[PDB]
């Protein structure tokens, strides 16, 4: 599977960052960490890019949709890029982990924990003026041997880190109650 | 699938071409009777990897093992040219496909 | 610990583990490539 | 779990099949006393890998060391066939599972 | 592309310089006719890797196999200096590029 | 930290045990004065790997070199049993831990 | 930067210490005129890798090749101790830094 992310950062910026890192991390992917990671807060977070707040980087399931999201949150940019990302366990199905509490179910978001490393980026499309300019530029640092046959993280692993606020209804309901961190149970 | 070079090469011999196989197990067995190196596919199929003492086949067999293990470790499929004259079938040529 | 802190904390551990996973897999493919 | 093939092979011998082990440590020891190559499971269990100067076992035992190293780095599971005789137990067949 | 060093060294020979090749298949074959190691590009190009029994060329040819394996697994490109004298063309020099 | 088995074997000899070591540099030196393989830790420690021309020890020292490299590449910690007889201390046993 | 250890052993010789280099190409060449193993830095510098047939140097040069190749594959920097006598310069010692 491939996931897609419309992002305003140029391939050169991504290379320098070591990947597509969350908004709260200042160092290269392998060097630093988001200052705060919370899936629930992230899915609700609204500036100058597509959702990448609270330790996660948003991706969607199709080029068409990443493009729509691009025109929506990145409209106003003369140019942006749509990164093609290989499936791996750092990607969490937001609709599947948050259930009925998923804020933007239409987005089919697959949240990338801590961002996406450069070796996971298969390639990218350049979007000039709202139009996809040409074909996909293959990322030379993509490491196929590392990602061949991996898939997104199973929902069970996400329930434990859903991050709903303390005393939120979800913490008293199955499945979340069965995986909730101690200090979150009522 | 098998490159043309590989198909034509295998079809030139008495072995049989086996395309797009996923290796999921890698066995090293020194027990005196099953002594050898085997691979098992996702479909349960078993094959033995050829061994050789002398030059130059000792190089080709060593690479065969390296190819088998790399397939197991990465999920990259392999095409084979194996002799059905034994059970398990013996691998005479292997192609790692990325 | 608060619900928040424990979530962040658990999340950081998951990330660290993923990053280690990639490093070790890369390392493994490299040793397989460079060794005789 | 181990392949039927791997299971039946270990059956015809003295060794005891050990399924789904997770190796977490790899040891290289040259001290007089402990000269050898060892591996350690998550449960604290220890095994010794077979070595052989002669061919073709020098091939098989070298593949064992490679399988051990891979398991320890990948967290992938192995199934062994160890002889309960010596201490630590000696691996006579190993199977890497993807 | 090829380093200036690589380009120049190749140009001083009767072999052809092939630049930025993406290898996707690695072949090991012991069948009596096609006994050898080969690589296939994403376009269907096929090259035979050279072999040498003696020192120091055995060191160099061993490194060529390592480079071919690394390129196929990782997707890193290679620049080759291949002799068209044989078909498939033999590799006389290969450069792994990042 | 070190496995009990590893801990026991070292404390059986005259060598020192070192645990949770972070190796950050791997060195190959042929300059006759400093001719050898060395490793440097994140704290500034320097150790040299043992070499051995004959079997079975040639196998152990080779494995010793693979472990050191795996450590520098992955960040995985190692535990060492090094003899304080020389300067730098020579590593008689090493354990890689996931 | 190069370990204090490394800076010292190199400065004890006629070779120059080159530090924090980023290797980008790894070359194996068997053309009789340029026969050898070479590496190219990101800035176009070219070096020859030493070789030795006899123990112990055959071990150190083998690791020198692995260190060089692991550096191209990973992008990790290296520090070298290279002789200016020949052209391209010869690597007498190399330090892979994490």
UniProtKB/Swiss-Prot annotation, chain A:
GO terms under cellular component: extracellular space; host cell membrane
Highest taxon in the source lineage: Bacteria
Catalytic site: 109
Residues that span the membrane, as ranges: none
Molecular functions per Gene Ontology: molecular adaptor activity; toxin activity
Residues engaged in binding NAD(+): 6-19
Keyword Cell inner membrane: no
Swiss-Prot/TrEMBL keywords: Disulfide bond, Enterotoxin, Signal, Toxin, Virulence
Subunit relationships: Heterohexamer of one A chain and of five B chains.
Family: Belongs to the enterotoxin A family.
Record function comment: The biological activity of the toxin is produced by the A chain, which activates intracellular adenyl cyclase.
Designated name of the protein: Heat-labile enterotoxin IIB, A chain
Source organism (scientific name): Escherichia coli
Included stretch of the parent chain: 21 to 207 of 263
UniProtKB/Swiss-Prot annotation, chains B, D, E, F, G:
SS bond partners: 10-81
GO function terms (MF aspect): toxin activity
Alphabetical UniProt keywords: Disulfide bond, Enterotoxin, Signal, Toxin, Virulence
Gene Ontology CC terms: extracellular region; host cell membrane
Coiled coil: none
Keyword Phosphoprotein: no
UniProt keyword Aminoacyl-tRNA synthetase, yes or no: no
Quaternary structure (record): Heterohexamer of one A chain and of five B chains.
Functional summary from the UniProt entry: The biological activity of the toxin is produced by the A chain, which activates intracellular adenyl cyclase.
Protein name, as recorded: Heat-labile enterotoxin IIB, B chain
Residues of the full protein shown: 24 to 121 of 122
């Amino acid at each position: 599977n491939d996931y897609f992310r419309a992002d305003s950062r140029t391939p050169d910026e991504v290379r320098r960052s070591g990947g597509l890192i969350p908004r709260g991390q200042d160092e290269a992917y392998e060097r630093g960490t988001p200052i705060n990671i919370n899936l629930y807060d992230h899915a609700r977070g609204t500036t100058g890019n597509t959702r990448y707040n609270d330790g996660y980087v948003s991706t969607t399931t199709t080029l068409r949709q990443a493009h729509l999201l691009g025109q929506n949150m990145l409209g106003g940019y003369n140019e942006y890029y749509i990164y093609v990302v290989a499936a791996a366990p750092n990607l969490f199905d937001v609709n599947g982990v948050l259930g009925r509490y998923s804020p933007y179910p239409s987005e089919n978001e697959y949240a990338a924990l801590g961002g996406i490393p450069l070796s996971q980026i298969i390639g990218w499309y350049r979007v000039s003026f709202g139009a996809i300019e040409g074909g996909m530029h293959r990322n030379r640092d993509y490491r196929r041997d590392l990602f061949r046959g991996l898939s997104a993280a199973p929902n069970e692993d996400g329930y434990r880190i859903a991050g709903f606020p303390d005393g939120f209804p979800a913490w008293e309901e199955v499945p979340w109650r069965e995986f909730a961190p101690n200090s979150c149970l009522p | 699938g098998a490159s043309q070079f590989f198909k034509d090469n295998c079809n030139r011999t008495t072995a049989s071409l086996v395309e797009g196989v996923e290796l999921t197990k890698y066995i090293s067995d020194i027990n005196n009777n099953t002594d050898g190196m085997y691979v098992v596919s996702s479909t349960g199929g078993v094959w033995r990897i050829s061994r050789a003492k002398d030059y130059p086949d000792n190089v080709m067999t060593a690479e065969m093992r390296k190819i088998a293990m790399a397939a197991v470790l990465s999920g990259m499929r392999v095409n084979m040219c194996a002799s059905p004259a034994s059970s398990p079938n013996v691998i005479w040529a292997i192609e790692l496909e990325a | 610990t608060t619900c928040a802190s424990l979530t962040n904390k658990l999340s950081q551990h998951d990330l660290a583990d993923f990053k280690k996973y990639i490093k070790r897999k890369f390392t493994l493919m490299t040793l397989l490539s460079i060794n005789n």
